[PDB]
């Protein structure tokens, strides 16, 4: 009648609430009337069309939303969109109803809410206990229909907008939490805590504990440490099965929501359980997809967080050891900043003759040396050509210097004068034409390190000092230079592609082990044919013997100096060569040999080298003749020797 169309229009006038719940009251309360039903309520059919939900019964807006599987007798309504009555009952729907309900069920009118839009039962409108003459009519059903035909659109939309308002909210939630667990990849311990806090507020649990699978067992240290079998109890099952587990009653216990962690694959890597719901009977079957959502970020973060500990742990042990090879070398910040005072200086300002074969590196001050190295590499365009952080480079140089010990001869001062030669060779013989830049770098870096941590060596041959060992010692020096590169902010080969970096290691390993006179002798016959048959810049092999050769030549480079200079150094070579050890455990008439020993060295070792050098580099002849000369001075000092 136009009369129902009075009360209805009156209704919709009133349904102006923003809350789908408060709208439901008005609609219910109006039916509670027009059907003489004691109590009325709507069971909203789930999005997945597989569950019923009821948040408002009668004139009471339930504290917690009641829900339950979309059964059969109550689940057939949804299907044929036909209205049923109590006499059409399972004892379940009758149990789960009068339970959710709260009383005697004598009557019941189920009229399906079918949308004119989607066109499907969206809600199950229920009327119970007909006030009095328990008689729900074929018209009691009509009034219901009629009501929703107008009222349903809005009801549903205010309800839906409220679902997206929630959905939108559990993301900003997660967006937040994602950004909080990721700010602690530093500390699996802090992170592990975050996961707990966050996991507790997200679901609103009384308590969360988190277990990290440790092989065949769960360890929720969460402060003490708690081991236990990986397959035992709740945690063990969930961990074993890799699938969530929800508990209504567990039997201040009650409920437990427990979920897996799993990694990139689906390998459960940990497990977490929440106990007891706050403001609730259990865990919203929504508190599961939300927990699963979260649980992705827990697995992502734990996985990397642990994988980062493993490194830091290891890498630490790696240096605990490496500082052992260091005699703990002290290169203080003040030390390096002091040397590195924005002025690397230029070689030109070092000295006029600083670059001519007639220079005597030992002639400089010892505190003015590490500079020269910076200005020597600088001018060889190596700092910029390779983008060498200076704070690092100046730290290397100071460390390599503090790495030399103190014998007469085998001291840092020998390493500098050996490197300075290398430097000379570079300029004077223009090495850029014969070898790649990375070689001239390694050759020089080697000169700087070849005798590191040396302590001095000692019917004998000089090429047993200034020379060989079993390569044992050459391997040491190389090994020591490595410890330096392995020291923080000292690795000057920081940015080299792994490609360069490796070869930068091999190069240095070869060159330094090349400083073994016993090795030189071995390749010597190879160093000749190359001298005989040019020197292929394309020949990878020829590069090797050149680099050996140059090294050797820098190493005994003191043979090419002035007589009075070689005279002075020979003192140091021989002061060393003749002393100490384990002999300690219990010379003038044996310094008489210093001449023959010396003469023999030059003739047999030293000259055959400078001969070669000038047999490849004619610019290198001045060195040979210098060696051949000094040889003759030595020859005279030998005349004074008896026979």
The tokens of 506 are what?
């091999």
Q: Which of residues 437-466 bind Zn ion (CB under 5 A)?
A: 451
Distance CA 291, CA 613 (A): 76
543 is annotated as an active-site residue: no
For residues 572 and 408, is the Cβ–Cβ distance under 8 A?
yes
The tokens of 628 are what?
């051949």
Q: Closer CB to Mg ion, residue 12 or residue 518?
A: 518
Q: Which of 146, 319, 341, 410 is catalytic?
A: 410
Q: Helices 412-429 and 540-555 sit at what angle, rounded to 10 degrees?
A: 130
- Judge whether 223 is annotated as a binding position: no
Q: Using CB distances below 5 to 8 A depending on partner kind, what does residue 278 bind out of Zn ion, Mg ion, a copy of itself, none?
A: none
Burial bucket for residue 579 (CB in 10 Å: 0-12, 13-18, 19+):
middle
Contact between 68 and a copy of itself (CB under 8 A)?
no
Contact between 587 and a copy of itself (CB under 8 A)?
no
Q: Using CB distances below 5 to 8 A depending on partner kind, what does residue 578 bind out of a copy of itself, Mg ion, Zn ion, none?
A: none
Please choose, out of 269-277, 424-432, 479-487, 551-559, the segment that lies near a copy of itself by the rule CB under 8 A.
479-487
Contact between 515 and Mg ion (CB under 5 A)?
yes
Of 398, 474, 457, 430, the residue nearest 578 (C-alpha): 457
State the sign of the Cα–Cα–Cα–Cα dihedral 173, 176, 179, 180: negative
In whole angstroms, how close is the CB of 198 to a copy of itself at the nearest point?
14
Determine which residue in the list 555, 598, 610, 620 makes contact with Zn ion, applying CB under 5 A.
555
Give DSSP secondary structure letters for 109-124. Answer: EEEEEE-SSS-SEEEE
Determine which residue in the list 244, 245, 329, 461 makes contact with a copy of itself, applying CB under 8 A.
461
Distance CA 514, CA 520 (A): 7
Determine which residue in the list 132, 138, 164, 590 makes contact with a copy of itself, applying CB under 8 A.
164
Please choose, out of 31-39, 69-77, 411-419, 473-481, the segment that lies near a copy of itself by the rule CB under 8 A.
473-481
Name, in order, each residue with C-beta under 8 angstroms of 153's C-beta and a sequence gap of 6 or more: 117
Determine which residue in the list 334, 342, 367, 582 makes contact with a copy of itself, applying CB under 8 A.
582
In whole angstroms, how close is the CB of 319 to Zn ion at the nearest point?
28
In whole angstroms, how close is the CB of 85 to a copy of itself at the nearest point?
27
Contact between 575 and a copy of itself (CB under 8 A)?
no
Please give the backbone phi and psi of residue 38, each rounded to the nearest 5 degrees, phi first. Answer: -70, -45
Q: Which of residues 439-478 bind Mg ion (CB under 5 A)?
A: 451
For residues 572 and 458, is the Cβ–Cβ distance under 8 A?
no
- Judge whether 552 is annotated as a binding position: no
Q: Closer CB to a copy of itself, residue 43 or residue 485?
A: 485
Q: Which of residues 322-381 bind a copy of itself (CB under 8 A)?
A: 324-325
Please choose, out of 51-59, 135-143, 361-369, 509-517, the segment that lies near Mg ion by the rule CB under 5 A.
509-517
Residues paired with residue 85 on neighbouring β-strands, in sequence order = 109
Tell me which residue has its CB nearest to Zn ion.
555
- SS3 readout for 248-300: CCCCCCCCEEEEECCCCCCCCCEEEEEEEECCCCCCCCCCCHHHHHHHHHHHH
Strand (E) or helix (H) holding 583: none
> How many residues of this chain interact with a copy of itself, rule: CB under 8 A?
97
Contact between 581 and a copy of itself (CB under 8 A)?
yes
- Judge whether 375 is annotated as a binding position: no
CB-side neighbour CA atoms (13 Å) of 340: 17
Q: Which of residues 251-280 bind a copy of itself (CB under 8 A)?
A: 264
Structural gaps in the chain: residues followed by a C–N separation over 2.5 Å? 222, 251, 458, 586
Contact between 379 and Zn ion (CB under 5 A)?
no
Q: Closer CB to Mg ion, residue 519 or residue 544?
A: 519
- Judge whether 450 is annotated as a binding position: yes
Contact between 497 and a copy of itself (CB under 8 A)?
yes
Distance CA 161, CA 174 (A): 20
- Judge whether 555 is annotated as a binding position: yes
How many other CB atoms are there within 10 angstroms of residue 135's CB atom? 9
Q: Using CB distances below 5 to 8 A depending on partner kind, what does residue 622 bind out of a copy of itself, Mg ion, Zn ion, none?
A: none
- Contact residues toward Mg ion (CB under 5 A) are 451, 515
Detail the residues annotated as belonging to a binding site for Zn(2+): 414, 450-451, 555
The residues that are catalytic are 410
Residues flagged as binding site for Mg(2+): 451
Task: Tell me which residues touch Zn ion (CB under 5 A).
Answer: 451, 555
């Amino acid at each position: 009648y136009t009369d129902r169309d009075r009360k209805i229009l009156q209704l919709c006038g009133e349904l102006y609430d923003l809350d789908a719940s408060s709208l439901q009251l008005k609609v219910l309360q109006y039916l509670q009337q027009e059907t003489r039903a004691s109590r009325c309520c709507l069971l909203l059919v789930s999005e997945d069309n597989l569950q019923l939900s009821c948040k408002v019964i009668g004139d009471k807006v339930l504290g917690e939303e009641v829900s339950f599987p979309l059964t059969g007798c109550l689940g057939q309504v949804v299907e044929d969109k036909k209205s049923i009555q109590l006499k059409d009952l399972t004892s379940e729907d009758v149990q789960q109803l009068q339970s959710m309900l709260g009383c005697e069920l004598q009557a019941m009118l189920c009229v399906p809410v079918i949308s004119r839009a989607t066109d499907q039962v969206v809600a199950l409108a229920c009327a119970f206990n007909k006030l009095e003459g328990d008689l729900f009519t074929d018209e009691d059903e009509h009034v219901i229909q009629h009501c929703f035909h107008y009222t349903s659109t809005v009801l549903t939309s205010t309800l839906a907008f409220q679902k997206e308002q929630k959905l939108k909210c559990e993301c900003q939630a997660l967006l937040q939490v994602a950004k909080n667990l990721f700010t602690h990849l530093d500390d699996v311990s802090v992170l592990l805590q975050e996961i707990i806090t966050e996991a507790r507020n997200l679901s609103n649990a009384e308590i969360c504990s988190v277990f990290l699978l440790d092989q065949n067992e769960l360890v929720a240290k969460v402060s003490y440490e708690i081991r236990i079998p990986a397959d035992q109890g709740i945690a063990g099952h969930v961990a074993t099965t890799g699938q969530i587990l929800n508990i209504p009653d567990a039997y201040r216990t009650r409920n437990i929501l427990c979920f897996p962690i799993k990694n990139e694959n689906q390998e459960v890597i940990g497990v977490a359980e929440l106990v007891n719901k706050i403001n609730g009977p259990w865990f919203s079957k929504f508190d599961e997809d939300l927990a699963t959502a979260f649980s992705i970020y827990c697995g992502i973060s734990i996985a990397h967080s642990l994988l980062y500990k493993k490194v830091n742990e290891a890498q630490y042990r790696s240096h605990l050891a490496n500082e052992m090879m260091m005699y703990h070398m002290k290169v203080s910040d003040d030390e390096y900043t002091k040397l590195l005072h924005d002025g690397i200086q230029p070689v030109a300002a070092i000295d006029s003759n600083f670059a001519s074969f007639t220079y005597t590196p030992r002639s400089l001050p010892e505190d003015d040396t590490s500079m020269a190295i910076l200005s020597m590499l600088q001018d060889m365009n190596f700092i910029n050509n390779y983008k060498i952080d200076c704070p690092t480079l100046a730290r290397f140089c100071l460390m390599v210097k503090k790495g030399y010990r103190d014998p007469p001869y085998h001291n840092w001062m020998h390493a500098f004068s050996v490197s300075h030669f290398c430097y000379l060779l570079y300029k004077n013989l223009e090495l850029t034409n014969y070898l790649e830049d990375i070689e001239i770098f390694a050759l020089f870096i080697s000169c700087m390190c070849h005798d590191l941590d040396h302590r001095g060596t000692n019917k004998s041959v000089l090429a047993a000092l200034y020379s060989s060992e079993g390569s044992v010692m050459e391997r040491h020096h190389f090994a020591q230079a490595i410890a330096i590169l392995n020291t923080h902010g000292c690795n000057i080969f920081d940015h080299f592609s792994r490609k360069d970096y490796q070869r930068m290691l091999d190069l240095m390993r070869d060159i330094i082990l090349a400083t073994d006179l016993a090795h030189h002798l071995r390749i010597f016959k190879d160093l000749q044919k190359m001298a005989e048959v040019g020197y292929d810049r394309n020949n990878k092999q020829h590069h090797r013997l050149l680099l050996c050769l140059l090294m050797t030549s820098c190493d005994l480079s003191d043979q090419t100096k002035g007589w009075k200079t070689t005279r002075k150094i020979a003192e140091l070579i021989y002061k060393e060569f003749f002393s100490q050890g384990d002999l300690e455990k219990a010379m003038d008439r044996e310094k008489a040999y210093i001449p023959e020993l010396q003469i023999s060295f030059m003739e047999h070792i030293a000259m055959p080298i400078y001969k070669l050098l000038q047999d490849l580099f004619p610019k290198a002849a001045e060195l040979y003749e210098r060696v051949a000369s000094n040889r003759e001075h030595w020859t005279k000092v030998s005349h004074l020797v008896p026979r």
